[PDB]
């Protein structure tokens, strides 16, 4: 029950520079890094599914963790059409307190 098998990792190095080797100190860490990240994606995508009062992990909350934290957009999956972007819901209390900063400044 391992997800990466040291031949898929070796081809990942061969596609970058084919005359390059890794050490077993580096390979045993490149494997650790992979598994450790799988865990942090899932542990922080289950709670987004738990906040949707659902019990199924969809692809719409593995998207929101990688985009916001890890800066990864995985292209070939597609989403629903994004709703019209709400720009500024500035409240009345901010519209009247910030209209006092200018009232003292110029008057």
């Amino acid at each position: 029950n391992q997800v990466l098998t040291k031949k898929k990792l070796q081809d990942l190095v061969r596609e970058v520079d084919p005359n390059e080797q890794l050490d077993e100190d580096v390979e045993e860490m490149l494997l650790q890094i992979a598994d450790d990240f799988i865990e942090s994606v899932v542990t922080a995508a289950c709670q987004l599914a738990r906040h949707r009062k659902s019990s199924t992990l969809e692809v719409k909350d593995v998207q929101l963790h990688l985009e916001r934290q890890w800066n990864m957009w995985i292209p070939g999956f597609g989403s629903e059409e994004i709703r019209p972007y709400k720009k500024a819901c500035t409240t009345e209390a901010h519209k009247q307190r910030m209209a006092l900063i200018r009232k003292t400044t110029k008057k």
Binding site: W73, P75, G76, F77, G78, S79, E80, E81, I82, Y85, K87, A88
Partner: protein, 87 residues
């Protein structure tokens, strides 16, 4: 969502050297890049300039990121006037 750029994008990949018959899962990828590119150049364009979508702020993002998008938007704005001067 359906695919709104399935037949148009196959002509464009042939235009840049791909094939006459690209794979379906490659146009699956390129169709999702364009919808995010138009979204992530409109979500950031409604905070700059004003909270509208005037094209005087679409030309701001193209400088200092890639000059090919800026040198190919000055040609589409110049040739709009040379194609109304001919009428």
């Amino acid at each position: 969502r359906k695919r709104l750029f399935s037949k148009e994008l196959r002509c464009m990949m042939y235009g840049f050297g791909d094939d006459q018959n690209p794979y379906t899962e490659s146009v699956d990828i390129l169709e999702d890049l364009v919808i995010e590119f138009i979204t992530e150049m409109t979500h950031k364009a409604m905070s700059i300039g004003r909270q509208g979508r005037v094209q005087v702020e679409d030309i701001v993002f193209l400088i200092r990121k890639d000059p090919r998008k800026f040198a190919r938007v000055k040609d589409l704005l110049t040739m709009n006037e040379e194609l109304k001067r001919a009428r």
